[PDB]
Design a protein around this ligand. Sequence first.
Ligand SMILES: *[C@@H]1O[C@H](CO)[C@@H](O)[C@H](O)[C@H]1NC(C)=O
Ligand SMILES: [Ca+2]
Ligand SMILES: [Cl-]
Ligand code: NA
Ligand code: NA
Ligand code: NA
Length: 496
Amino acid sequence: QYSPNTQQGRTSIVHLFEWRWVDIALECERYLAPKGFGGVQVSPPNENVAIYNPFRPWWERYQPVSYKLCTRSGNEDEFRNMVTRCNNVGVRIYVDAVINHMCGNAVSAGTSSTCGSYFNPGSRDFPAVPYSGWDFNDGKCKTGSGDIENYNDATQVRDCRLTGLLDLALEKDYVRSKIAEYMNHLIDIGVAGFRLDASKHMWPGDIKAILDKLHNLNSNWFPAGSKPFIYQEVIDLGGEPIKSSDYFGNGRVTEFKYGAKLGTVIRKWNGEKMSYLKNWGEGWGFVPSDRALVFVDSHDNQRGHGAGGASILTFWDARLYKMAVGFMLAHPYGFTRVMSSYRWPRQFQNGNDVNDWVGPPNNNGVIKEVTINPDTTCGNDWVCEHRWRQIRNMVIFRNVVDGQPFTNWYDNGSNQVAFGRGNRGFIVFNNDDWSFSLTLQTGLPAGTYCDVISGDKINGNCTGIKIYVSDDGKAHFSISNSAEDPFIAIHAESKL
Ligand SMILES: *[C@@H]1O[C@H](CO)[C@@H](O)[C@H](O)[C@H]1NC(C)=O
Ligand SMILES: [Ca+2]
Ligand SMILES: [Cl-]
Ligand code: NA
Ligand code: NA
Ligand code: NA
């Protein structure tokens, strides 16, 4: 469960948030494969409620109607076509599994679903599965409202409705079996793992019972005995009885403290600074590296919907964001997930975005295709951060230095720091209000290296900054606090 099952030398996953299956299929072939990406986290592939008020919000996909692979991203055939084409070029697919609940208990009954399946929240009937009143936690939940009211009570957090979402009785073998049926079908057609949505809201033991029913990965694409990669969504910021460690027996856990803290130090909140990052990792109260799924921002908190709060850096903060993603991809801690978003009309009023519900770019509710511009950026309002040179090159940087230890750390006691990864890579950051100009020990072999942040290595030359490493491994770095990207990165494969 702990291993991502990516092809050897592939160390990251990209969340192609709300992308259609046909676009991901193409992306795997034209970009993800040749650029060394390990895999893709796809949006929930199961049928959900079609919500019109507001108009097709992104969150409607977290309100299941059935397990039919039929959504705005595509039908069952288009989904498998995607998994097959991606696997064929060595790029994995990870499914966002929404298995804790079905839709909101107040949603009107009918066929307002992405595949037309009928469902009646009020009567607890979802015939397409099928689920009935016997499969929900109505009787088990002890709160007066029936919803989660107090997180200091680990029981209601698991047995009551998350914001009114009908809560499945995951202790029942019938329910466990219907979920396993859905997940095994996905495994058998090729998915390499799952994001277990709302895991804090499920008992560690119930998740375990469901995982016990899962098959090994498709033996045509994966080695015999491969188990699906499992990363559970648990937002654990430290002040509750439920700890993400309670879920280690099932697989990895999302480390939401990661992006939260990286955001506060890079924004320099509360006197924090990059020099403090020398002991980044468990030293900051994070889960063990081998149990962490890390990221700077997620589809949830990039729009203030989850946790990490106001400190979270996103594509909106492009300059600082690239640097944060750069530090994450260079540092050995955890398994990295990079975000790929769509632009929405963010509109702040009293410090809150009233358009944080807005769904993916669409024409009358039909998600727009991802267009690729000549400069390799995306059109149709897809941000495509994974295509930003500064990020894509750090994804490659991570692959190049994989297995190499964190070494040669340097800091000016403020916000100018640097560190290397064995003798395969080195990165330098300047987040102070003044220039950084100094000779650093890089731990790299002598030679000329292309800085992969400002440019690229192209046919024996560099398009951007060049760094010269001497025989003792030292090299001079000069970064202005006014630089477009205040950080430089070089590695074994960017050497001329
Ligand atoms: C690098 O670029 C220069 C021109 O700027 C050219 O003379 C040289 O041959 C190029 N090197 C390679 C290896 O293509
Ligand atoms: Ca639950
Ligand atoms: Cl997440
Ligand atoms: Na392997
Ligand atoms: Na969630
Ligand atoms: Na095992």
